[PDB]
Amino acid sequence: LNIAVLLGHSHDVTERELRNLWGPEQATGLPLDVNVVALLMNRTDPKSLITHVCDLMSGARIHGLVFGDDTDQEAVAQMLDFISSQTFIPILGISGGASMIMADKDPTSTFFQFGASIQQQATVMLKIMQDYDWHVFSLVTTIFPGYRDFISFIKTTVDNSFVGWDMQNVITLDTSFEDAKTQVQLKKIHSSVILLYCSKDEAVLILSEARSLGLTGYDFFWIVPSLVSGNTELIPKEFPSGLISVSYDDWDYSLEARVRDGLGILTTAASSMLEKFSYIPEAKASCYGQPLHTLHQFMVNVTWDGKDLSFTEEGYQVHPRLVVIVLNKDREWEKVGKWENQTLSLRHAVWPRYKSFSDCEPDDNHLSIVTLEEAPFVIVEDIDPLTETCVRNTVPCRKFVKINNSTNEGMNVKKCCKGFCIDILKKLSRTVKFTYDLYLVTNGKHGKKVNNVWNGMIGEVVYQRAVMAVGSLTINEERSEVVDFSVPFVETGISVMVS
Amino acid sequence: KIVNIGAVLSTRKHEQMFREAVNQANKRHGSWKIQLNATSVTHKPNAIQMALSVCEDLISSQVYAILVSHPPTPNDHFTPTPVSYTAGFYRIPVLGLTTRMSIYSDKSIHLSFLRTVPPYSHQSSVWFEMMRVYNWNHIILLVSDDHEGRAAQKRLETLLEERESKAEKVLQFDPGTKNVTALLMEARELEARVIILSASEDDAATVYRAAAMLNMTGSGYVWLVGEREISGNALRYAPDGIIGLQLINGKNESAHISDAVGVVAQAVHELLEKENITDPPRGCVGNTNIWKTGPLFKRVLMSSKYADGVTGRVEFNEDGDRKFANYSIMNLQNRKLVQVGIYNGTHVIPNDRKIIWPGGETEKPRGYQMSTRLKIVTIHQEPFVYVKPTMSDGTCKEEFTVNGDPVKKVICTGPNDTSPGSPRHTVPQCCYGFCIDLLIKLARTMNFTYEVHLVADGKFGTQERVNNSNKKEWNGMMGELLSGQADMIVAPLTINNERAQYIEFSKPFKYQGLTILVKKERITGINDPRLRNPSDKFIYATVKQSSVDIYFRRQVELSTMYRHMEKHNYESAAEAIQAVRDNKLHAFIWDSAVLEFEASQKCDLVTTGELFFRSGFGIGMRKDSPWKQNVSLSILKSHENGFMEDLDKTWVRYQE
Amino acid sequence: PDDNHLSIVTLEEAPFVIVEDIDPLTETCVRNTVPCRKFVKINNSTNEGMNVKKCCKGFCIDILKKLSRTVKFTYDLYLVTNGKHGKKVNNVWNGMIGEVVYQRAVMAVGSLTINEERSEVVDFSVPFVETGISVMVS
Ligand SMILES: *[C@@H]1O[C@H](CO)[C@@H](O[C@@H]2O[C@H](CO)[C@@H](O)[C@H](O)[C@H]2NC(C)=O)[C@H](O)[C@H]1NC(C)=O
Ligand SMILES: *[C@@H]1O[C@H](CO)[C@@H](O[C@@H]2O[C@H](CO)[C@@H](O)[C@H](O)[C@H]2NC(C)=O)[C@H](O)[C@H]1NC(C)=O
Ligand SMILES: *[C@@H]1O[C@H](CO)[C@@H](O[C@@H]2O[C@H](CO)[C@@H](O)[C@H](O)[C@H]2NC(C)=O)[C@H](O)[C@H]1NC(C)=O
Ligand SMILES: *[C@@H]1O[C@H](CO)[C@@H](O[C@@H]2O[C@H](CO)[C@@H](O)[C@H](O)[C@H]2NC(C)=O)[C@H](O)[C@H]1NC(C)=O
Ligand SMILES: *[C@@H]1O[C@H](CO)[C@@H](O)[C@H](O)[C@H]1NC(C)=O
Ligand SMILES: *[C@@H]1O[C@H](CO)[C@@H](O)[C@H](O)[C@H]1NC(C)=O
Ligand SMILES: *[C@@H]1O[C@H](CO)[C@@H](O)[C@H](O)[C@H]1NC(C)=O
Ligand SMILES: *[C@@H]1O[C@H](CO)[C@@H](O)[C@H](O)[C@H]1NC(C)=O
Ligand SMILES: *[C@@H]1O[C@H](CO)[C@@H](O)[C@H](O)[C@H]1NC(C)=O
Ligand SMILES: *[C@@H]1O[C@H](CO)[C@@H](O)[C@H](O)[C@H]1NC(C)=O
Ligand SMILES: *[C@@H]1O[C@H](CO)[C@@H](O)[C@H](O)[C@H]1NC(C)=O
Ligand SMILES: *[C@@H]1O[C@H](CO)[C@@H](O)[C@H](O)[C@H]1NC(C)=O
Ligand SMILES: *[C@@H]1O[C@H](CO)[C@@H](O)[C@H](O)[C@H]1NC(C)=O
Ligand SMILES: *[C@@H]1O[C@H](CO)[C@@H](O)[C@H](O)[C@H]1NC(C)=O
Ligand SMILES: *[C@@H]1O[C@H](CO)[C@@H](O)[C@H](O)[C@H]1NC(C)=O
Ligand SMILES: *[C@@H]1O[C@H](CO)[C@@H](O)[C@H](O)[C@H]1NC(C)=O
Ligand SMILES: *[C@@H]1O[C@H](CO)[C@@H](O)[C@H](O)[C@H]1NC(C)=O
Ligand SMILES: *[C@@H]1O[C@H](CO)[C@@H](O)[C@H](O)[C@H]1NC(C)=O
């Protein structure tokens, strides 16, 4: 319909491509009067914003509004929510401060953002923690507003899982910390994974206190929401190299694809609501001197260009685009985790140490260990689909599965190992107190020198890709020549099976 | 040196009162060169021009703190919103003075809003203080408004988390609808009579009419509401004896404005003591950056402690709300609002007036009208709960035992298994046997009636995950227990760990273990290693969603059988008996005495020799309830004599 | 807040609470057992007595050790000296029942039957072993 697309930005992007953004699209054009008006803006003060909104509503009765932003001012979305609560205009935010998450809305409000809620982002973070089997963790929050729903959703989600999340205490703060009694709350933390919910102005001080108290080891893990991960450029030195954050900022979907999706949602709602009643667009006459069929209760069943862009009762998206980023040793953010309809898709099933927070970390306990499938010793099975978790006697592993022969590319599909040697490895990890990254070999069987090249586990250990082969392995002369063995543990010679 | 202070105000007299409070704030606060200036705006009927007038006035004014005191004459909804949004854009503090909506408590919307009035949610705190006076522990919460009432429900569940005693039932619905009588019936059927309501005027008048239709003004009923229910047309139709809350000097505007101006004045004179002081500039000319000491000045306002005040001691909490507010506790003495109590923030003191209750005399309502009738659910267990269709008209054929003892049968209600597969009638039916006679002995012991019904689907109940959001739920008899449809499960229920975490257990009346039914070729129990890796010649399974499934899901070395028998689970035990009778199976995993009874029925059915998971059938119970002690004592009284032996002589020991 | 020093009384029975002397050559209980004490009156003339430290093992001792390793509580174990399990004599309980009722013992981990009067005066846990009455003949 009469739809305005406003871009309050700083990087100069032209406007006529937004006029072309509808032309070859809408192949089945059901509405009879659709005109888009693209505007650019450099000042986001609310007086001028409401003035331009009233001018566009007097500007040939614009019924749909699209607003984009590149800044971090999140109150502009709240002002648009107030504008939609009065003028009855469906308004769709895009990015920047236009899509930063606000909690609750009004039934007169028809403003809806393009972003994921903090509850869905908590589901995201607990899915990430489930996919690495990081079961024991801690929760540290502050007095930043929006914390009671966060802790409440975590307490419901732990009580809705077969995982058995062995959670430590929930640590809050009171004021700006004296480092006297909040330090007592921080010293009780001894588990690995810490979920931290605090603002960006507070997170630098809290992570500096954690680094000063030795809470930034590579055994430990720090996962934060999008509250601190704002500007990609602004990265202080106090962020630990190995921080895992989640944000909906995708570099693959720019502002043009987002406003294309917003125009698709608006045209889909206009063309689908026209099939029920004809005269749906009824704009307010003027902003000076003060409806049955609205799109507020019609936005649920929308699907344009295959994208499931459906909306929720709280105003969020049903299947929103999330991005899971890490902080490497290069002090930059790397896009790692992408998203299915409901579940996670990781680019790297291998989770490395990300050890170098700084040069002050000399420790070493992880051991790259390869094994091989033997039926009484190493049974490798699929993960249980009921829990998406290896059962407790099994351990996680990966397998570089190639579907077909010519393609060298394969996927490190996670599976579960059990048996005799797995019990030996677990008891050694209990006694010697070390960690490991157990995985399988794809070169073949145990070991054979194929023209001065060893294959399998011997080829892993000799070429130093694996530290040790804890898995089952026979011992003969040349294997004792090329590597070193331990004391034997089971009387395994050879034998002959007959009837 | 000047300080500008804005004010959104109603009248013209209180404009003069605001200017007089500015003049009094410059009286004793020192001979420093700072001054205080006053700026006042009035109403507009629409809110867009209200925000327009506020920004056009106060961008040019450069104010620090804004006082907003809208009285709702046409509409009671969201009139102080636009000034709050406009100054929260620049993070300028707004002191709300007349509004009390709990949506302002969430600072995720209003970034720089405070208020010197308490909202309705802290009334729930007083309602928590209503529980310690009369030793009440079970309440019934009816929330009408979905705008702010979820915050009051969250505050009530937060304050009852310290006692670890949840409400008996919470109910939520939509304002605007009238026919809410089913919610009142659900409030009726429970034993508690404490009713807690938070609503607007019209929905409160609606539920007052619908409660007057349903005898809810009588004896035992306790009605506990807030300020919005003791006024308007809801006051016209309010039930007598109701307990309500009222703000002391909550609409006294002059002293409230004066106390707020004193708060702002001491905040300013504390702000001038510090350095790095900036001013919020003319924001209309290209100013998108917020005021840099915004959170600093907000932290000054949050930690601003006061001992002075005309209304009283004003103090902000961690969320910017009025602490320790004095409340009036009002009673409705035959359509007369009578003050019967006062509320300081920590304790309640009633006056010399007596609290006349909605029922009869002045005695306090012990609001636990405990039920003599108990909802009983059970499953059709063939040696325990015989379920048999009626003979002539809803009645049981009087059958005798071998000694002439009449079989004590009861008229239960039995639905069929497949409700879409056949025309489903849900007819009453006859229930008797072992556990039924045990229940008849229990009802003979203590004076209570009962209503035996059956489960909708033939499952005991397992911790099963629902599809959306992967959430855990319960089904079966436990699913009908936790949903309030049942009160006491007298059934062959297997005691384990996962059930006792959520419900309570009496002491077990039956002691037995798991065993194997076969057709007679020895098997010798679970320790046959050839069944550890089964094949097409070892066809054995268990009942779908039984306790055996959970017991084999826990033990990891029994996982392989758990990955086999999951392909062949059956809906009930008798179907498995009929399947293994025709040699369509090879073994079956079930409890001891049931399979011994089936061996006493059919000689080809043979129980194995081994035995594992030596556990007990007890009575499935609710949470904290007065049926915990005497039920276990009555079962133990049945154990100390030979009554359990006589029940064994009825069916368990009885061979054929 | 120190509410975990749980005083526990137990009773000497052969299959459950094997009560042995400490090794006189090492003065240490063997590590698969637990320490205990017994208040033995040396002289019969007056009520003087000494708390001889001894060793305990068996079935319920393993239950106590697995409870101490699962719930993670401390426990202070000692034998009863007034006699057997207990019986209401002149409205005065004795034994383990008396040590729980008179609040000198927190819980009764040792072997103990269940009847109506005990469930009146104390509170049992869930039963962990099917132990009724029985008749021995030749
Ligand atoms: C102090 O406040 C007064 C009252 O708000 C200000 O006087 C107004 O100044 C504006 C300037 O545009 C005039 O339009 C109004 O006519 C004045 N008030 C009236 C009569 O409404 C005054 O400017 C302020 N002084 C300062 C800067 O401290
Ligand atoms: C409550 O309303 C009353 C109405 O009289 C007001 O109280 C008086 O207000 C006048 C004007 O400010 C003062 O001169 C008096 O001192 C007040 N009453 C007394 C104590 O005599 C006021 O608007 C409200 N608050 C108070 C103070 O009760
Ligand atoms: C409101 O304030 C008074 C004090 O003005 C409170 O009185 C104190 O209450 C505690 C607990 O009952 C006593 O131990 C103190 O001795 C009391 N002190 C004084 C000076 O009275 C009172 O409890 C509060 N609530 C009400 C109205 O009961
Ligand atoms: C459980 O049974 C006991 C049997 O003693 C009941 O206790 C008696 O009941 C009266 C009822 O008024 C109580 O005042 C006393 O505690 C007991 N009798 C006396 C005088 O000591 C108890 O009420 C029963 N509880 C229920 C209802 O389940
Ligand atoms: C901001 O945008 C408006 C409209 O495009 C333009 O007139 C103005 O010159 C711009 N301001 C600056 C300083 O670029
Ligand atoms: C949405 O509309 C389409 C029309 O084909 C169809 O899938 C169905 O009727 C609707 N589904 C929902 C979720 O309402
Ligand atoms: C969502 O599910 C459908 C099948 O219902 C599938 O075709 C589609 O690829 C899924 N989307 C994603 C992102 O995998
Ligand atoms: C491998 O072969 C199968 C069967 O022809 C085929 O479906 C699959 O796409 C191939 N995979 C590739 C292209 O690597
Ligand atoms: C290629 O891989 C497939 C399994 O994906 C396997 O069936 C086939 O034998 C392989 N081809 C050869 C001969 O390597
Ligand atoms: C609507 O109103 C009636 C009035 O008695 C009420 O009982 C019922 O809950 C509602 N619907 C019906 C008629 O069942
Ligand atoms: C209210 O109480 C009476 C008691 O006699 C009974 O008829 C019924 O429960 C109710 N009748 C009405 C609606 O007055
Ligand atoms: C306060 O102002 C001084 C002078 O402009 C400046 O140097 C200092 O950085 C400010 N205060 C702080 C942040 O220490
Ligand atoms: C409440 O009233 C009492 C008695 O007048 C007074 O002492 C107390 O300061 C008042 N508290 C507040 C905050 O109004
Ligand atoms: C329940 O069971 C029978 C047999 O399946 C079925 O015909 C009927 O729907 C129900 N009861 C009656 C009335 O026989
Ligand atoms: C039955 O209930 C009545 C009324 O409460 C009471 O008098 C009696 O003691 C109860 N017990 C018996 C004898 O069933
Ligand atoms: C969820 O999926 C199950 C099958 O796993 C199905 O029986 C059930 O009907 C679905 N939905 C509900 C109502 O839980
Ligand atoms: C018991 O009494 C005798 C004297 O009658 C004394 O020799 C002995 O030391 C006493 N027992 C003690 C205190 O060990
Ligand atoms: C009581 O007397 C005997 C006498 O030999 C001796 O064992 C000791 O003094 C006392 N024994 C007991 C019962 O402790």
Short mmCIF file of C-alpha atoms in Angstrom, two decimals, chain A residues 123-282:
data_model
loop_
_atom_site.label_atom_id
_atom_site.label_comp_id
_atom_site.label_asym_id
_atom_site.label_seq_id
_atom_site.Cartn_x
_atom_site.Cartn_y
_atom_site.Cartn_z
CA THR A 123 17.12 -20.72 24.64
CA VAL A 124 19.91 -20.07 22.10
CA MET A 125 22.60 -19.93 24.80
CA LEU A 126 21.36 -23.06 26.56
CA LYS A 127 21.25 -24.83 23.19
CA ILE A 128 24.90 -23.83 22.68
CA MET A 129 25.72 -25.17 26.15
CA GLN A 130 23.81 -28.38 25.38
CA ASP A 131 25.69 -28.91 22.10
CA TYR A 132 29.04 -28.92 23.95
CA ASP A 133 27.73 -30.90 26.99
CA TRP A 134 28.86 -28.13 29.35
CA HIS A 135 26.42 -29.21 32.01
CA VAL A 136 27.78 -27.71 35.24
CA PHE A 137 27.67 -23.91 35.11
CA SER A 138 27.02 -20.72 37.07
CA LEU A 139 24.75 -17.70 36.59
CA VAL A 140 25.90 -14.17 37.45
CA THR A 141 23.52 -11.23 36.94
CA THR A 142 23.31 -7.61 38.12
CA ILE A 143 20.66 -4.97 38.84
CA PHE A 144 20.34 -4.01 35.17
CA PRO A 145 16.61 -3.99 34.32
CA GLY A 146 15.36 -7.13 32.66
CA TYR A 147 17.02 -9.65 35.00
CA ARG A 148 14.05 -11.24 36.80
CA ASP A 149 12.59 -12.59 33.55
CA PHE A 150 16.08 -13.81 32.58
CA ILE A 151 16.64 -15.75 35.82
CA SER A 152 13.02 -16.93 35.75
CA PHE A 153 13.31 -18.30 32.21
CA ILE A 154 16.57 -20.04 33.10
CA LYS A 155 14.93 -21.60 36.18
CA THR A 156 12.05 -22.83 34.02
CA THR A 157 14.38 -24.11 31.29
CA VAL A 158 16.54 -26.10 33.73
CA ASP A 159 13.27 -27.54 35.09
CA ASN A 160 12.26 -28.48 31.50
CA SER A 161 15.27 -30.58 30.41
CA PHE A 162 16.54 -34.15 30.69
CA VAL A 163 20.08 -32.75 30.87
CA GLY A 164 20.18 -32.17 34.61
CA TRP A 165 21.94 -28.80 34.63
CA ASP A 166 24.03 -28.86 37.82
CA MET A 167 23.72 -25.13 38.37
CA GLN A 168 25.63 -23.17 41.01
CA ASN A 169 24.17 -20.15 42.86
CA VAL A 170 22.66 -17.10 41.17
CA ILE A 171 24.93 -14.16 42.00
CA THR A 172 23.61 -10.60 41.80
CA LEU A 173 25.10 -7.26 42.86
CA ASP A 174 23.89 -4.31 44.94
CA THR A 175 25.80 -1.13 43.96
CA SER A 176 29.09 -0.14 42.39
CA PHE A 177 31.25 -2.84 43.89
CA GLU A 178 33.54 -2.12 46.85
CA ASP A 179 35.46 -5.34 45.99
CA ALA A 180 34.83 -6.33 49.62
CA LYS A 181 31.54 -8.26 49.82
CA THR A 182 30.74 -8.78 46.14
CA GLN A 183 34.19 -10.38 46.02
CA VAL A 184 32.86 -12.92 48.53
CA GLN A 185 30.04 -13.67 46.08
CA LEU A 186 32.55 -14.05 43.24
CA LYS A 187 35.00 -16.29 45.15
CA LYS A 188 32.37 -19.04 45.52
CA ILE A 189 32.47 -19.61 41.74
CA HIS A 190 34.55 -22.66 40.85
CA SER A 191 32.62 -24.20 37.93
CA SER A 192 33.63 -23.76 34.30
CA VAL A 193 30.85 -22.01 32.37
CA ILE A 194 29.65 -18.61 33.60
CA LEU A 195 26.62 -16.85 32.13
CA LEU A 196 26.98 -13.10 32.65
CA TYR A 197 24.02 -10.72 32.33
CA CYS A 198 25.07 -7.08 32.76
CA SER A 199 25.37 -3.88 30.75
CA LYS A 200 28.37 -2.92 28.63
CA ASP A 201 29.39 -0.20 31.10
CA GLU A 202 29.39 -2.82 33.87
CA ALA A 203 30.81 -5.79 31.95
CA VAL A 204 34.29 -4.29 31.57
CA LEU A 205 34.58 -3.78 35.34
CA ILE A 206 33.11 -7.21 36.12
CA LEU A 207 35.41 -9.03 33.69
CA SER A 208 38.36 -6.99 35.01
CA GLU A 209 37.48 -8.13 38.53
CA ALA A 210 37.17 -11.70 37.24
CA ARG A 211 40.57 -11.48 35.54
CA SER A 212 42.06 -10.01 38.72
CA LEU A 213 40.64 -12.98 40.67
CA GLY A 214 41.71 -15.63 38.16
CA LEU A 215 38.30 -16.38 36.64
CA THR A 216 39.56 -16.19 33.04
CA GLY A 217 41.18 -19.58 32.49
CA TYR A 218 40.72 -21.66 29.37
CA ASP A 219 38.96 -24.25 31.52
CA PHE A 220 36.42 -21.53 32.28
CA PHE A 221 33.97 -20.18 29.71
CA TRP A 222 32.16 -16.86 29.36
CA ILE A 223 28.93 -16.58 27.36
CA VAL A 224 27.16 -13.22 27.16
CA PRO A 225 23.99 -11.99 25.42
CA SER A 226 23.65 -9.10 22.94
CA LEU A 227 23.48 -6.53 25.76
CA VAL A 228 27.26 -6.04 25.79
CA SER A 229 27.96 -7.02 22.14
CA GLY A 230 26.93 -3.78 20.49
CA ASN A 231 29.41 -1.94 18.28
CA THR A 232 31.65 -4.43 16.49
CA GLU A 233 34.47 -1.88 16.36
CA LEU A 234 34.39 -0.90 20.05
CA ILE A 235 36.21 -3.79 21.73
CA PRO A 236 38.02 -2.91 24.98
CA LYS A 237 41.13 -4.78 26.08
CA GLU A 238 39.29 -6.31 29.06
CA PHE A 239 37.18 -8.65 26.92
CA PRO A 240 38.51 -12.22 27.32
CA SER A 241 39.71 -13.87 24.11
CA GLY A 242 37.27 -16.77 24.10
CA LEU A 243 34.07 -14.88 24.86
CA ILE A 244 30.97 -16.37 23.22
CA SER A 245 28.21 -13.91 22.34
CA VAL A 246 24.93 -14.04 20.43
CA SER A 247 23.58 -11.21 18.29
CA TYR A 248 21.14 -10.97 15.40
CA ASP A 249 23.48 -8.68 13.42
CA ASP A 250 24.18 -10.65 10.24
CA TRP A 251 26.73 -9.45 7.70
CA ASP A 252 25.12 -11.70 5.08
CA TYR A 253 21.73 -9.95 5.36
CA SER A 254 22.32 -6.21 5.00
CA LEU A 255 19.77 -3.41 5.40
CA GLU A 256 18.46 -3.87 1.85
CA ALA A 257 17.48 -7.51 2.41
CA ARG A 258 15.86 -6.55 5.72
CA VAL A 259 13.75 -3.77 4.20
CA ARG A 260 12.94 -6.16 1.34
CA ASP A 261 11.66 -8.66 3.92
CA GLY A 262 9.70 -5.89 5.65
CA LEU A 263 8.07 -4.83 2.38
CA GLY A 264 7.32 -8.50 1.74
CA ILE A 265 5.59 -8.79 5.12
CA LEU A 266 3.58 -5.60 4.50
CA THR A 267 2.52 -6.61 0.97
CA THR A 268 1.67 -10.14 2.14
CA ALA A 269 -0.53 -8.78 4.94
CA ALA A 270 -2.15 -6.30 2.55
CA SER A 271 -2.83 -8.91 -0.15
CA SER A 272 -4.06 -11.54 2.32
CA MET A 273 -6.27 -9.18 4.34
CA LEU A 274 -7.80 -7.90 1.09
CA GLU A 275 -9.27 -11.37 0.49
CA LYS A 276 -11.36 -11.07 3.67
CA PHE A 277 -12.42 -7.40 3.60
CA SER A 278 -11.64 -4.88 0.88
CA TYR A 279 -11.34 -1.41 2.46
CA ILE A 280 -8.68 -2.22 5.06
CA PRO A 281 -6.39 0.93 4.82
CA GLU A 282 -8.05 3.73 6.81
#
